[PDB]
Amino acid sequence: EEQKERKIMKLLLKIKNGTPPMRKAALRQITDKAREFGAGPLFNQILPLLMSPTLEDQERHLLVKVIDRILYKLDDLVRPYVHKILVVIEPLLIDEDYYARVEGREIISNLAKAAGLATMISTMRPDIDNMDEYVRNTTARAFAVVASALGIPSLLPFLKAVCKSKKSWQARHTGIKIVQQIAILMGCAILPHLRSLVEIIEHGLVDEQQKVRTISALAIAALAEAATPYGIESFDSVLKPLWKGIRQHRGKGLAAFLKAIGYLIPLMDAEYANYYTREVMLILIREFQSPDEEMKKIVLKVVKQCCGTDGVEANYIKTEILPPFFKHFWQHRMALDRRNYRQLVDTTVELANKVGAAEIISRIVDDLKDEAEQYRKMVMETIEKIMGNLGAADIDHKLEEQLIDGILYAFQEQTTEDSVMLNGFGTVVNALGKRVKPYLPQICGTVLWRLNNKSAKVRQQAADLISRTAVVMKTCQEEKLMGHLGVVLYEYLGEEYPEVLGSILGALKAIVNVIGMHKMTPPIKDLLPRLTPILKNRHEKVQENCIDLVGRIADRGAEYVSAREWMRICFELLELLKAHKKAIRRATVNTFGYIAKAIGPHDVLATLLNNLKVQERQNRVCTTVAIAIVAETCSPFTVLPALMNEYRVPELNVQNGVLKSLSFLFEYIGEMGKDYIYAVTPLLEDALMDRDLVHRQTASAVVQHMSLGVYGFGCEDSLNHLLNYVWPNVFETSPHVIQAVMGALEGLRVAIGPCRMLQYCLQGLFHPARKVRDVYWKIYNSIYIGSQDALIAHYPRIYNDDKNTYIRYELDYIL
Amino acid sequence: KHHPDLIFCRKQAGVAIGRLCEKCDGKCVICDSYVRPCTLVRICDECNYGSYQGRCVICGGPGVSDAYYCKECTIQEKDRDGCPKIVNL
Amino acid sequence: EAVPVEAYGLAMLRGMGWKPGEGIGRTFNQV
Amino acid sequence: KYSEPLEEHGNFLITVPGGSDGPSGVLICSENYITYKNFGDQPDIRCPIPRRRNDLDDPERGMIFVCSATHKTKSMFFFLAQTEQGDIFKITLETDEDMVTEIRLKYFDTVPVAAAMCVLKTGFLFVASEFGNHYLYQIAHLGDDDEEPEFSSAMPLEEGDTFFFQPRPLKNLVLVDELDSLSPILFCQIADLANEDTPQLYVACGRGPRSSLRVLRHG
Amino acid sequence: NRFTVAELKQLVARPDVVEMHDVTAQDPKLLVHLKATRNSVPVPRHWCFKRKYLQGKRGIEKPPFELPDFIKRTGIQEMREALQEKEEQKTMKSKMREKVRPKMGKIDIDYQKLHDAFFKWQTKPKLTIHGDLYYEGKEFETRLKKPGDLSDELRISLGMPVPPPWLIAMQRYGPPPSYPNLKIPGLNSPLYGDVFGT
Amino acid sequence: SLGNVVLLLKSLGIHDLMHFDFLDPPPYETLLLALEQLYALGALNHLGELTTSGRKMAELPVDPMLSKMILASEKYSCSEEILTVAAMLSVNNSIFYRPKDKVVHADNARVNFFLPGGDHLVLLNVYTQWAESGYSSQWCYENFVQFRSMRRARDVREQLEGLLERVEVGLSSCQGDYIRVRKAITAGYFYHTARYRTVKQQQTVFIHPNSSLFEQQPRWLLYHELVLTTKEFMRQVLEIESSWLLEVAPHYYKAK
Amino acid sequence: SYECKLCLTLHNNEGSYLAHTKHQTNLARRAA
Amino acid sequence: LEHLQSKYIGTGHADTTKWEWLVNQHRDSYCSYMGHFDLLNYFAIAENESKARVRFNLMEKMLQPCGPPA
RNA sequence: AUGAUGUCAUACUUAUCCUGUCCCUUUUUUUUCCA
Ligand SMILES: [Zn+2]
Ligand SMILES: [Zn+2]
Ligand SMILES: [Zn+2]
């Protein structure tokens, strides 16, 4: 009694205050002594714990574990406390939080497995007739969880006794809500009980009560969704009065009957679905003018379901449904609601994919030329999605010209920053393909007319359209038009606005990528002297696009620009490496690699060796990366004597730059650097022996990247030679250098093997010093986690001691 | 380029595919290198499913490209280590 | 002021019961 | 879901196929005791493994199912198991769809030293030998052709031995193929002493009396 | 709770491997059993040192680097030093003048000389043992100057051909009391070059 | 919650508070946290009943969380300062009048009003220099203060000066010992404290821009109010060190 | 880097050695 | 460290016992001998022993590694 | 003889990143005065 309650409080404070092993031991002791303490004080201590609002997530998870173990160890001991557990967990059964609802479902499953479903059925039998809506919905959620825990026929005769009885329509409504919630929770598990559920719901499906008939049609629609695509003969019992209820029911009952008809229509026979579609499409034409928003959304969902339903043909749909659909649903009031506009666009794309997108294009070409900006943008997005789905093969040339004029009017009255209609413009013109070659010059003339604007953003959007349309301009290879536009953009190159300049530069990137090499006007030697002062701009997008264009030029066309101008560009890029964007610095590194491939690696390496020792700031790691790319693209055997002599400069950062470029270069080249291991051995040994431990950190990065690179090539002797400095250097303090030590140790354990690492770790893990022994133990634990496969073979021979048998006879038992 | 905080899940990778944004595109998910991106990233959980759909498994931008393990990390086979999508703690 | 003397009111409230208005959490159309 | 504890440790287990193929049970093997039981109201039928009639081996080696294979027909399923001696014992199933009652383990054929045995249909029974020749067998009789005694799970005993099922003739099936394997190749001696197009390599292999040196010469 | 150094000497087969503080460990017998193998390494002594590992040199200067023989045979250092000295004698006005108008010829010797230096003239270095521990020293104890063996300077300046002038005195004294394990070949233990004994 | 009226309904003869008849019951967690807060206060016994002090803190209609101001008054005095503070922090309308435009003039007057140690001492200086200023509208106009609500605050100060003999607490003051005034303020404000995180609610704190300590985020700060508008905001903070915080409600306090 | 042999003192900056001029205390200690 | 690495096999510190580390090493050696096909065949064909008997011996030796602890 | 230890500036690391925030309402007890 009192001692049992004190022990329950002691185990509760040990669970909620001690270590989690002590909490697991307390949970095991509670599961052992649940029968000793009884379910009385267990419930009277768990329901305050369940009702505590400030409990932690781990605390309530441990409470769920304790309740599950106590339920498994007690079973029917909490049979009088079924009602207390039900009134505690009925907020948990109707919990709006998903994790709390899952925990409540698990607790309901534990209670059904422990106590029994008959006590819960006797508890919910007065609650089945709950006239209150929230109490009936909580009872519906609890009964759905109980039916999921105990199965369908554990309560299906009780449900057939309750729902078929006419005691109260609130009891019938609550029971059909239980049926619908259980079918939604089960899904495919309601397939063997499809005829049973149809016979249970056929009594309420023709009920004179509007709410009972509505919840019966909702449960029929939920069963048709859950048992897809089985139970067609089960659901065919209410197939004939569904068409009568589509004419008889009004309002919410009509919406529920239409939803049940739309859910039962794709599971029916094709002649029956065709006849029912022809019957209900006349009502759906009358349902197009539904003023309620939720009713209009349900009707549009029914239209989408009928479009997804096969066997309703395409010509009949396009003649019957689609001009009233474009008359009623394609309106500005439906387009203003963004959920309704997106549902309308998705339904129109699905219908266009079902019955051809040419009819939707010919019916939405005027709505693309509608003056409303958001409505015209939604229409143009729908036409773009229909063109991406079907294509432009069904589009005639006159309709294509009308669509081109409509989207040009949209680009004229494109007031907002709408790049989605720019992408749709590119999509429709790319789907047109070679057919836009008659359409090219008036589009180019209008774009050049918009490029004379007072507004910067208008000319910016025109240059973005040029960047989008360069590929489709060069599909037909209009070389004279492309060269003329290149000359006009060469005149446009003196723009004073940076976003316009970046758009022009991206357009030139596209144009150079799509023309071909010996066919642009002006040529590369007539362009890169013009491009040379452009790189002195301070704007980031201009710098990014210009460096990308220089990357494409130095990739392809090395045969027009002198190496004097190439290393002048390198002199500009040395100042340009201090940009904030790592993508800009990465593309700068790429241009350095292209120029090193082009002009030769001597003067660029001398320039970078001058620059790297001179920077000494919050930069120049990208200079080491660029030096690594100059070496790797152009045979690092040439570069390595210069870098090795530059290591002999005592200037306190140039050696760090040499080692950083060495680590980056070894990571870049991988297995090709096996011959240079003997060359990089004494420099790495001196950097590990250096007093400045940042040099030892970057040499540890060198060792890590070399062990990443040339594993499997006999470099393990030199790796062990460097590890003879690395493993003495495990006395580091800073997190950067100790992370470098950990990474180099992991790389060396990968490279040489686990046996030498075990020989190092086993002689240090038994140290008397706690910190050194724990550090070597953590290193050994990381090595064992990495190499647990061969650790049994690499384990040393230990004799059997007095504690247990340790000399393994399985090794001696050899066949 | 890493941090001592911000562990990801340390949970075993499943069918939810990793996804990279543009701000840190092309880097490895572990060592942040760029050499031979070999193995697709799986992020083990609702790290893809739900609210973080099509998002970065690194810093948090709009995820546009498939995240890849590099061949240097799959040399020691760090691709089996689990989810690399950052959960802030 | 002690530990079990702050839980006798919670034990009495658990013995009495819980009302739907006593913390009416608004939730509808749940799935 | 279910947790059936056993005091004896399970060296191996064979599961009876549920549904129309029999009960949804499992037979955990031990020393001369195959406990067949199902997750539910089923009896733990301890079928005794039928020892040889006056077996010259010592009784420390308990008869356990080293290799077990459930060869199923359209409705029922027989169970061919090898003891510590390794004789092929076909077992019936008189469960009668209520509980594990009888598993008539009769030694249908004497089997050699096999690492594993799998008995498919249409005259297929591949017994992989640890040493010697792996046997692929074709079915001749119905599988119950036992010249030795039958130890059913419902067959009573004195709780000290089983049905004295001695080494029976191979009447149930005939090993149509005996593919000799060089494993476990212990010793080797390769020389061109013999007159052949390639040298003879004698790999000495096998265990006990089932041991041989295979001299192979190519060409 | 622990045994002394004489008890550890009696219990273990390697009494020299029994450290002063390793007997104060939780498992000193297991530590001695792990340390008794021939493939074990000691702890670096910065755990016992107040001074940090390779930090307290503080009063010395060192040569930066010595290039390998193939790199010195290619000779990048000479024109690299010439370019560096020309850059030093340049003014900064001349520096951005040469930035805006560059010039040819950085080194531009050839390619296959550097290729053969990396591959054909590649020499493997002297990699040390698996159990080497580096410390503040660990680069100077190369005498193990063999005991009982002279040096090359003692062979050259005293006129000892490959006969020392103190060989009769060393043979008359026999084994010296300083190094009784020393072997003196040619006078005491009847030896090529400088090392005339072991 | 019902933190002002649980004490009043307890002192007006109802012990069956959650069994009391109503149109709709309050949430039980609000009542439970009110009763556990009253346990942490010196107002309830082990049996959950009001003491003589529990009855006397319901003589005055302010919150019990602001009546531990009065219960820390005359512990080591400083009663007048914290009684003024308990009067002026019971305002309904918010203090200070910062309109559209002007901005910098009101900000400079408010910065002139700033003192270290939270905004309670700042507005205490506001009321102190409003005393012996004629109680004029011109003062609040040039100091950008609403001359409607803090006049009601001095009326509340007059009423709480009048309602002091029933609790039998004098108008003692420590004469500028404002660290001891903050000790009494912290003796009141023990439940509403934070370390960049609340130690009880486990919520990451955010400091309001209208607070006097919006910059210089401290190691230990109490607060008064928990209004979320955009962030988890700390309203009416005060600097502490969790020394005398451990003195008050030690049953509430464990593990720093 | 800069080394003060009269103190055995490291200096990352030249102004550190310039201000290191305690220096005379360890200089008089090394003079003994 | 990591919580999953502590939950992983091979977690150890300076507070980890030598006998506990040897017991974990013996359990890992028995698990590796069970997993390896060649090592189990070498352990089984050494004597006149069955594969299921060797598997039962390995399952017994998994508990026997924690059999006589300290 | 090299340790503890102070916010002292300088150095360096990290392909670290180029940076965010001001409340809709609202009620709450009791005592004296001069020709
Ligand atoms: Zn990587
Ligand atoms: Zn990112
Ligand atoms: Zn994850």
PDB file of C-alpha atoms and ligand atoms in Angstrom, chain B residues 28-33 69-70 72-73, ligand 1:
ATOM      1  CA  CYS B  28      30.743  16.360 -51.398  1.00  0.00           C
ATOM      2  CA  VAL B  29      28.278  15.914 -48.565  1.00  0.00           C
ATOM      3  CA  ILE B  30      30.977  14.724 -46.126  1.00  0.00           C
ATOM      4  CA  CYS B  31      34.436  16.059 -47.014  1.00  0.00           C
ATOM      5  CA  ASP B  32      33.087  18.809 -49.365  1.00  0.00           C
ATOM      6  CA  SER B  33      35.426  17.838 -52.216  1.00  0.00           C
ATOM      7  CA  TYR B  69      29.079  11.001 -52.212  1.00  0.00           C
ATOM      8  CA  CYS B  70      32.534  11.382 -53.686  1.00  0.00           C
ATOM      9  CA  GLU B  72      37.280   9.609 -51.835  1.00  0.00           C
ATOM     10  CA  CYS B  73      34.572   9.087 -49.203  1.00  0.00           C
TER      11      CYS B  73
HETATM   12 ZN    ZN J   1      33.785  13.252 -49.902  1.00  0.00          ZN
END
